[PDB]
């Protein structure tokens, strides 16, 4: 059950995986509102993966433990700086988390995309499994995919406004389990953003 | 609780165990203080005969395990001058030794 | 009060409290995320923030000498990171 990938120029295939896990649609709506009077034009050079470190869960950890990295982060290199040369950029987006099982932990991850998160008071994230979500178990896959297409309002976002996605690994497994494997297993995240648009550029300084 | 010694190359020695409760069913953890400077945990003891020490110190570093007499004895050579701090029997609850050392996590605090 | 203190060292899923009455034991088993161990839980009560921020108490008197300690946990640099005060 080897899974592929490829996004633009780069691509790592996971040894063992579960199968991607969709959300809210399985291609991206409709491209160029009427309201935006067509100046988008689509990028292809800017999609390339950019590992990009998490916490990871150590024994002491909680169940109530929960994380969001704000989506998207600063970007070095091609698509680094892209949304600053350009406003109203819209992108749907393609993240994996990836985490060394050692085939003997019984603690249980469960990782959910979701949009527009506010803090939540850790009563909610009971129910967080709503959302787009696939939730590893290192006794059988060490990685999942989730895919999303943008959702906020349709014509276009200024990320430097408000971001409307957001990653939460909180640990549904309670604590870890240290059955003769490795005490601390860091999860990486390796966000992909796909097909992205744009719309005026910036005055630049250059 | 004390600054032990700089000049000396031989392993220090901070054997601060008492036994108010045993060290037979909790853990233990040693730390780096020194009058003012940042602070490092040396090491840590929990109950499954797994302690793991700082990795920026790993070879250098090795701290005693023996449950007789709730004992514990810092096992570091190629002590350096700038090895000028005073030390602590740090106590947590259990397993909290993970891989390095950690403090401020919930439930474990 | 509060720390200098980057987002990925101890926001990004971090606990920050260590706690002190240093005169001479920094070991008193003392935290801020939280009010546990007994000791020092009104009046000397903290809290963490989204970002570095550290533990806040009572104001307008002082009854404690000295200053207290802050840690938190690094996930760069595997070992732990301490300092401030």
């Known amino acids: 059950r080897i899974l592929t990938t490829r996004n633009g120029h780069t691509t790592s295939t996971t040894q063992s995986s579960v199968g991607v896990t969709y959300g809210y649609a399985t291609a991206e709506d409709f491209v160029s509102g009427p309201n935006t009077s067509g100046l988008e034009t689509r990028v292809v050079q800017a999609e390339r993966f950019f590992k990009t470190h998490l916490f990871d869960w150590v024994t002491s950890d909680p169940f109530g433990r929960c994380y969001q990295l704000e989506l998207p982060t600063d970007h070095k290199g091609v698509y680094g700086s892209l949304t600053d040369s350009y406003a109203y950029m819209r992108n749907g987006w393609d993240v994996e988390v990836t985490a060394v099982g050692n085939q003997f932990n019984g603690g249980c991850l469960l990782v959910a995309m979701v949009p527009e998160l506010c803090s939540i008071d850790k009563r909610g994230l009971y129910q967080l499994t709503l959302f787009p979500h696939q939730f590893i178990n290192p006794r059988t896959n060490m990685t999942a995919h989730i895919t999303v297409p943008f959702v906020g309002v349709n014509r276009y976002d200024q990320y430097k406004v408000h971001k409307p996605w957001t990653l939460v690994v909180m640990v549904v497994a309670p604590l870890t389990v240290n059955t003769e494997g490795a005490p601390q297993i860091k999860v990486y995240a390796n966000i992909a953003p796909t097909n992205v648009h744009v719309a005026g550029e910036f005055p630049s300084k250059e | 609780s004390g600054p032990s010694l700089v000049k000396p190359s031989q392993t220090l020695s901070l054997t601060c165990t008492i036994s108010?409760?045993?060290?037979?069913?909790?853990?233990i953890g040693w730390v780096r203080q020194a009058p003012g400077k940042a602070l490092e945990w040396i090491g840590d003891?929990?109950?499954?005969?797994?302690?793991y020490y700082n990795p920026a110190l790993k070879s250098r570093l090795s701290i005693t395990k023996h449950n007789s007499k709730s004992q514990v004895r810092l096992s570091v050579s190629s002590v350096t001058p700038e090895d000028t701090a005073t030390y602590y029997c740090?106590?947590?609850?259990?397993?909290?030794?993970?891989?390095?050392?950690?403090?401020?996590?919930?439930?474990w605090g | 009060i509060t720390c200098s203190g980057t987002?990925?060292?101890?926001?990004?899923?971090?606990?920050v409290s260590w706690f002190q009455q240093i005169p001479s034991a920094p070991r008193t088993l003392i935290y801020?995320?939280?009010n546990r161990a007994s000791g020092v839980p009104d009046r000397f009560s903290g809290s963490r923030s989204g970002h570095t921020a550290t533990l806040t108490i009572s104001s307008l008197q002082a009854e404690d000498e000295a200053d207290y300690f802050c840690?938190?946990?690094?996930?760069?640099?595997?070992?732990?990171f301490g300092s401030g005060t």
């Open positions: 801020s995320v939280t």
């Open positions: 840690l938190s946990w690094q996930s760069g640099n595997t070992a732990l």
């Open positions: 740090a106590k947590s609850r259990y397993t909290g030794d993970g891989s390095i050392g950690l403090y401020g996590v919930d439930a």
């Open positions: 003891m929990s109950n499954g005969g797994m302690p």
């Open positions: 987002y990925s060292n101890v926001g990004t899923g971090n606990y």
């Open positions: 108010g409760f045993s060290l037979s069913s909790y853990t």
